[PDB]
């Protein structure tokens, strides 16, 4: 795999979003991976609906948190609509999928990256954007304004994001806190520290969609 990967550069990443005041990170994270895999497979970059996951994944808790892998299962079993068809409202409402016509896309599966293994995650990232979790509660993470983030932080994971590349000493992550946070909405998290949890517990729970 290459020394540098950046899915943004290959046209597999849509603009940065803002989840606002709704704990829908899980849905944002999942959608990033969905958008990436469809571009990679089909050649087209689309935006897909975080709102539909929020409303429809009843295994998750709406604006109160949820599971990226639950959301990814739903898209595998049922499918997903385009973002413009089912736009983000930042509040959980009833599931409106049927009301909105046929699904725009469907994946075939969800896989787990082997946890606590940097090499396993880089390999995955080299193939497509991956759903990853980290500890974002610390003030240091929250106030991050650019550079390679090294912490401080523990491994009490609480935020789902998406990895969209890496370099010699960092993993490139797309956050869902708007373009005004970090490096235009992205963060570079130090890698290769030999900490098996990853910085801020980044190697805890990583998922990606399978599409044939």
- Show the 3-state SS of the chain: CCCCEEHHHHCCCCCCCECCCCECHHHHHHHHHHHHHHHHHHCCCCCECHHHHHHHCCCCCCCECCCHHHHHHHHHHCCECECCCCCCCCCCCCCCCCCCCCCCECCCEEEECCCCCHHHHHHHHHHCCEEEEECCCCHHHHCCCCCEECCCCCCCCCEEEEEEEECCCEEEEECCECCCCCECCEEEEECCCCCCCCHHHCCCCCEEEECC
Total tally of structural domains belonging to the chain = 1
Q: Which domain holds residue 75?
A: 1-212
Supply the residues annotated as catalytic. 25, 159, 175
Residue 95 in marked binding region = no
Residues making up the chain, counted from first to last: 212
Q: What is the CATH number for 210?
A: 3.90.70.10
How was this one solved? X-ray
Q: Nearest-5° angle of CA 173, CA 69, CA 100?
A: 95
Do 172 and 139 form a contact (C-beta atoms < 8 A)? no
């Amino acid at each position: 795999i290459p020394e540098y990967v950046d899915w943004r550069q290959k046209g597999a990443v849509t603009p940065v979003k803002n989840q606002g005041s709704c704990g829908s990170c899980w849905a944002f994270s999942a959608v990033v991976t969905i958008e990436g895999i469809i571009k990679i497979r089909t050649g087209n970059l689309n935006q897909y609906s975080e709102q539909e996951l929020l409303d429809c994944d009843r295994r998750s808790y709406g604006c109160n948190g949820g599971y990226p892998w639950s959301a990814l299962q739903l898209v595998a079993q049922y499918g997903i609509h385009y973002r413009n068809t089912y736009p983000y409202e930042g509040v959980q409402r009833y599931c409106r999928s049927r009301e909105k016509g046929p699904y725009a896309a469907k994946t075939d599966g969800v896989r787990q990256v082997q946890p606590y293994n940097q090499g396993a995650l880089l390999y995955s990232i080299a193939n497509q954007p991956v759903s990853v979790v980290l500890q974002a509660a610390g003030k240091d993470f929250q106030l991050y304004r650019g550079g390679i983030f090294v912490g401080p932080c523990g491994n009490k994971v609480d935020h789902a994001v998406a990895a969209v590349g890496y370099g010699p000493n960092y993993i490139l992550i797309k956050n869902s806190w708007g373009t005004g946070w970090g490096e235009n909405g992205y963060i570079r998290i130090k890698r290769g520290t030999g900490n098996s949890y990853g910085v801020c517990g980044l190697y805890t729970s990583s998922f990606y969609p399978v599409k044939n």
